[PDB]
Design a protein around this nucleic acid. Structure first.
Lengths: 310, 307
DNA sequence: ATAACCTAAAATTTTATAGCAAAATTATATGGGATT
DNA sequence: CCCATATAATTTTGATAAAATTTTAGGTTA
């Protein structure tokens, strides 16, 4: 009979969720509890737009305000199933998308970025980690999850069958795909292969660690335990800021561990790699995400291709 | 309460702004409902059992799989509206047709390059159908919808830049007669050399000006423009004559749209670069075009990932 | 004598989707330890 | 400045039918 109580019921309905979801839901539950639109009766469309106006004034980005709306709309979708859905509208009207464009790295930047890492006495230890990302386009947690079992040196193949993440409290835990759709095999090039060989040959001080039958992880922290998402993201934040201070052409504002995946995917799509073959290596279930890396065509473009394949 | 017939009828007025083909498509279902025992059942007393059982009768009656799956959507939206007005609690048509029925739909097989340049050679020689040769080369070289080909006029073409302007389609339905219902296509030399021939060999044009459109490129025997039915019916005769002159017959499902299927496929398997096929085909979503692309395995990626 | 065309009629197919949030990645404040 | 980590914010990612086209039955004509 209130909004805050409503979202609590929607949370108890679909309980089978990962750990990060529970955190993300609590953040929204904290927002509803800290706003006037959280103490009102569900039976009491204009206020939802006003709520969207306040979240924009809080400082939260467009998508952050957008994703939350979808959760509330589902909560009222079930409520109406059990008036009119007050969150049934387009956020594009109330607020504008001030989202930052994730500009990839130009081949000149990468050749200068890697050289900096290699020649930097502080971050040269992560060089082998970065090269593989620009050769496999692995997700950052997929990289941290790799063990000696998931590598095929003889056949040059990376078996991506899991991901290793760590959260506050729960600690380390292994996440796996339900069906065999998640599993994919990524081929190693000479740069990637010889990078893994250096990681294996230079691994030392691995403290005793086993989680759900996984051990001998490749990338470990200085504290003895494997690297996590935060450990690599925070390293990038320091590395890029150090690169920008010594290089005029500062790296893109989105130069994050995921941008290494951006750059990888964008390259192949530009070089004319098979769109479905790219979808596999990327691990996209829906082809739509992969096709976003491909440039929008024109008449001249469509004509050129027709004349190229005539 | 009210029956299903009265609910589907009420859902028809609520959503009126529909084109003629829709009305025809909606009327067929309304005939089915009146014919079926389901149409007389009160909306409230319709259970998931009754909804699934209806799908069985449709197949037993002879209807194809995709036919029953579309009518399922037309009826689901009706109960959905009936559920929105709080007439009833749950929607009986919320289930997968794959569980109750099998998808025995004929696979739409496009023409292989070997079949293509053997099918064209037959048209160019057969006295009865060489008049349509120029038209087919266009359908295969442009990948147009069949009514959109009928719509093409002298004004739509641009021989200077060799581009086709597709902005409309010409339709004909019983009673209404003819009626007109947004992309640009590059014309290859083979398609252009056909287009220049169609105009130079066009005559006996009747007076025809519909919705601001006149001088259609492809005309029937009676001087009036070709329709969708006239081309499909022509293909039913053409294919049957090919199969007698050749041992290895053509695909059973070879139709005007198969000439489009063949174009997109041959383009996709040629590796046509991004979304330019999507632009040349004219799909709203990119997902529709990717269906014309072959499924890739690990081996397909291995060779493609070579650099 | 058989197809070849035509048309009303009944059928099949083509085409259309953001988004009725989860679940990841990234940024930051804090604080201790190694460097310039 | 590096590193680790708790906290928090941002990003990345899972057909509630219209409107066409195809086929077919019946008839005439080449």
């Amino acid at each position: 009979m209130t909004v805050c109580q409503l979202y609590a019921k929607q949370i108890r309905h679909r309980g089978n969720v990962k750990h990060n979801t529970k955190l993300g839901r609590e953040r929204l539950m904290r927002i509803l509890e800290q706003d006037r639109l959280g103490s009102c009766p569900i039976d009491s469309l204009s206020d939802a737009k006003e709520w969207a106006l306040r979240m924009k004034e809080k400082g939260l980005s467009y998508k952050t305000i957008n994703n939350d709306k979808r959760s509330l709309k589902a909560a009222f979708y079930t409520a109406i199933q059990d008036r009119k859905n007050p969150f049934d509208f387009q956020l594009s009207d109330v607020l504008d998308d001030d989202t930052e464009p994730k500009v990839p790295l130009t081949p000149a930047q990468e050749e200068s970025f890697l050289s900096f890492i290699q020649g930097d006495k502080v971050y040269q230890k992560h060089y082998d980690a970065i090269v593989i990302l620009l050769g496999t386009g692995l997700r950052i947690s997929e990289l941290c999850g790799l063990t000696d079992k998931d590598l095929d040196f003889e056949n040059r193949v990376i078996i991506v069958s899991h991901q290793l993440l760590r959260n506050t409290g729960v600690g380390y835990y292994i996440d796996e795909p339900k069906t065999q759709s998640g599993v994919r095999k990524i081929p190693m090039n000479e740069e990637v292969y010889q990078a893994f060989q250096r990681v294996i040959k230079n691994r030392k001080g691995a403290k005793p660690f086993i989680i759900d039958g996984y051990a001998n992880f490749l990338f470990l922290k200085q504290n003895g335990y494997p690297m996590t998402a935060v450990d690599y993201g925070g390293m990038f934040g320091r590395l890029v800021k150090k690169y920008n201070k010594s290089h005029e052409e500062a790296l893109p504002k989105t130069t994050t561990p995921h941008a290494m995946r951006h750059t990888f995917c964008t390259r192949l799509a530009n070089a004319g790699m098979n769109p479905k073959a790219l979808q596999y290596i990327m691990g996209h279930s829906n082809i739509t995400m992969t096709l976003n890396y491909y440039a929008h065509a024109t008449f001249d473009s469509a004509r050129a291709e027709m004349e190229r394949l005539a």
